[PDB]
Symmetry: C2
Subunit: 532 residues, 2 copies
Amino acid sequence: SELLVNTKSGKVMGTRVPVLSSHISAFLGIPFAEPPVGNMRFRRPEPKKPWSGVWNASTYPNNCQQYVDEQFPGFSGSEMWNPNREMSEDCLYLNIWVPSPRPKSTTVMVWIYGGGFYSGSSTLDVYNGKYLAYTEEVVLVSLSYRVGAFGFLALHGSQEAPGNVGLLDQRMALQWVHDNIQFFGGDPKTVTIFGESAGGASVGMHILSPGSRDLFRRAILQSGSPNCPWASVSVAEGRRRAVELGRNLNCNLNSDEELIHCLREKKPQELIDVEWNVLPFDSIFRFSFVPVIDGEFFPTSLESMLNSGNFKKTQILLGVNKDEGSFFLLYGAPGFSKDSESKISREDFMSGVKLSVPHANDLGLDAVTLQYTDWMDDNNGIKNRDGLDDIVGDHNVICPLMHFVNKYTKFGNGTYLYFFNHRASNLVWPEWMGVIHGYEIEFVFGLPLVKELNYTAEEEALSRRIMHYWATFAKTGNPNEPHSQESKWPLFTTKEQKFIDLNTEPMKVHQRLRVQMCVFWNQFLPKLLNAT
Amino acid sequence: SELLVNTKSGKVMGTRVPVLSSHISAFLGIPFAEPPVGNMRFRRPEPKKPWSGVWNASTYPNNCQQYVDEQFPGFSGSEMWNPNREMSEDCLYLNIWVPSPRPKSTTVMVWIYGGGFYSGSSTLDVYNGKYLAYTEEVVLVSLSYRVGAFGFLALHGSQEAPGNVGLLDQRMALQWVHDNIQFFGGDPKTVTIFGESAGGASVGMHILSPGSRDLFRRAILQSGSPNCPWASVSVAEGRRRAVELGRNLNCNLNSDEELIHCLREKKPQELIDVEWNVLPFDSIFRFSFVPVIDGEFFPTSLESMLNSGNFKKTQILLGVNKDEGSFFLLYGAPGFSKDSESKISREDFMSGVKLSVPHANDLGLDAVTLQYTDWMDDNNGIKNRDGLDDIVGDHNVICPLMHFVNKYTKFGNGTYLYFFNHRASNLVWPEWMGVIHGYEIEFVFGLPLVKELNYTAEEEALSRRIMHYWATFAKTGNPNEPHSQESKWPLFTTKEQKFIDLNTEPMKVHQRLRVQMCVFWNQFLPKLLNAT
């Protein structure tokens, strides 16, 4: 039977699903690790033990225990990101969408969801692999991993919570795809991993980490890179936050064993209720438990790794959205509202800068303010709003990704850069938010192809172009069709630095994506903060 | 007789001179102080002793001993600024141009020449007061003062070279105009002092210095203000340079008396041959002997004086030229040439920045470079040239003058700001230099009215407009005609910050003259250099 597959872990029974008035196979909730419950909490994942009989993979699995956004109850705009399944510590499963008839050895794409390392699910509607699997004829895999304290608590030195166990979760899932995807029709030597936000940062971390390098061929990074100021911390800050977490739940803090044991006796929702109380600064776009430079998963510091060429050399495709920061200002900076134009005063602009660059001294806050203010129109509320918006995006997503791409391209075997600047017509968020963080995803998974969702005809055309780029790149290492007549997505080179805009208009090639600001955030500010 | 005048110092015999096919009286070389020779060198000026008989004031006086530019022998462009008379330490005289018939009590204008405090003469062709005296019907006075070491050597604490004796020279001349201009038809209670470069800085210093405040009514400052980074030094740096000057001429340095006496036995040309060897840094737009904050001429520091409103409150008219820096880059920065487009490479751009902001640490040099570089076109030789040009002008003339005008307007009784951006058609300097430092002067003195000099018809029209502005302002405190139908030069206010462009096109009002950069040079950089 086409829905029956025999893997090295046991037999699996999938289910047939309808897609664009046709059908494909889906194997949902296949386990790749033992349930990390009880004494296993905070610990590294263990391989799932083989099972007898047939595993029923016809329904989605549970979602990892996580913080749930309730800033706008009912609002589809925000709930479409919340977990749509029972949350549980027993969350390590993966989903596979296979074309029909089953391929013999086709291209594989493994998706890693984002969520600031504190949230995210593989079962969201936006992440439905069937449209893409169907339209491009590839085996689509989406894995899951532990987030929040459950996946990133770090007490370096002990083996009960070494840290980065959330990244080890992903590596585990990748190891399974490597050892079993062949039985689903996929080609293990042609797997592209791709992600967004924290997922984009994760993809960049497997490219850097020696233990993960051999498990995939190519990589796609969307709005996120490993060297982002929010994606990692030192073992010291990791330890400092683990302790404070324990202090918030009144735990015996005499020793790591003391602390860990107390944290293991706690109910999931208790660690989550106080998780945000451990951040060192009053800030925006920063998260409690994230990856930590431990000397294992990451040999040395990320910057020296990028400078020494110590990382997997292959082809990569990456880019960012036009308005990456608006989402965090809405939820955290004073002055912004979901229901108003949110024109910001000088007062709130500067409060926003303090919140966006939390680690900067007064001299630094002054440098940032000067760099993003038009003194010929300093009280223009719309200019201060977009100025604040640019700051959060540049400092957190764009300038860090341009540093990675420029360092990578020096040792890589091919780079393709995009800039997504199209605001979907059916967006429910206000206009002042623009091309929002995470909304390029819907085009990548092809939601515009389904009429009932209500996208324009040009938006569906865009979705197919992007789906063909990602897929054609996953198969060949080049987003372009060999002898096509269409426009060519030029290659990014250390010299020319070309990139393309991605919208519903005739393709246009550009150069030096936001250089002015990137030089400020990557060369000047770091230096200033260090000398002072 | 109309050419005979009896002053409180003695009788003076002037001469009739032709101007625009007419005539006016001229009293040239009237002395206002005793010849500062011999033992009087470096000492404060003494009032000229009355004389019997008639003083012959029909020919220009000598020029103060000074450095003479020989960078372009023959070149009119540079020689028109060199002394056109025998140089001599006996240089303290003043020139008066009186309308004919002699007025009874008309407006007086006293001109103070510029020259970086190391050069300058009242007898240059460009400074001929007859055209202005004639055209606007005002008594025009041009004084002289000692420059270089002769007028600014400062050994604070001693009375043999207290410092600022060059400013005391000007004050002396002003005291004479105050006590005698009435006998020439001028009104002593309506004297406007006005100057350019070092002269503009001098005018601003009489506005600040308690001893000079009562000697004039209004002031006009062109391309220069008291708080310019090149116009003054501390008593310590003044002392440090006086000593080094003495070290260069092998003088006994055991005591001030030792040093001063040795410097007095030296021939004028000997102090001038080594004058430039005392600058602390390799620099551009910096001069050896300039005014010094001594606690006498200047009560406290200039910044606290401007902040406390401690200065003469009256009306002032000031402005700057579009390309104030090009002249110093040509003579001192590597890459620039009088005979080429001078496109600058990245190498020379940065060498230029090091030369322009001599007192900045590496972090500061980086801030400046970042603020003036277009990273989307960093190797564009024309952009690096104009970028360097903007830096020198902004840091040395424009941003400092905007700080003064903004501080003054808070306690003043009226401010009028201009931006001169018209390049004369007969300029002999290359085009890349633009609207050069000191070339608005020719329009102020009305040289465009004399056909033989070869100016366009619109240039002569501009010269009359400007001459009427300066003169109408000198008489009333407002550059505009009471019930005129012409365009109005708006008043500059702390709130609106309006200013006008001054060229051959229909007047246009603007706001916040170069705010972006002015905030950088006045608020951020100072702060950065102080914290680091």
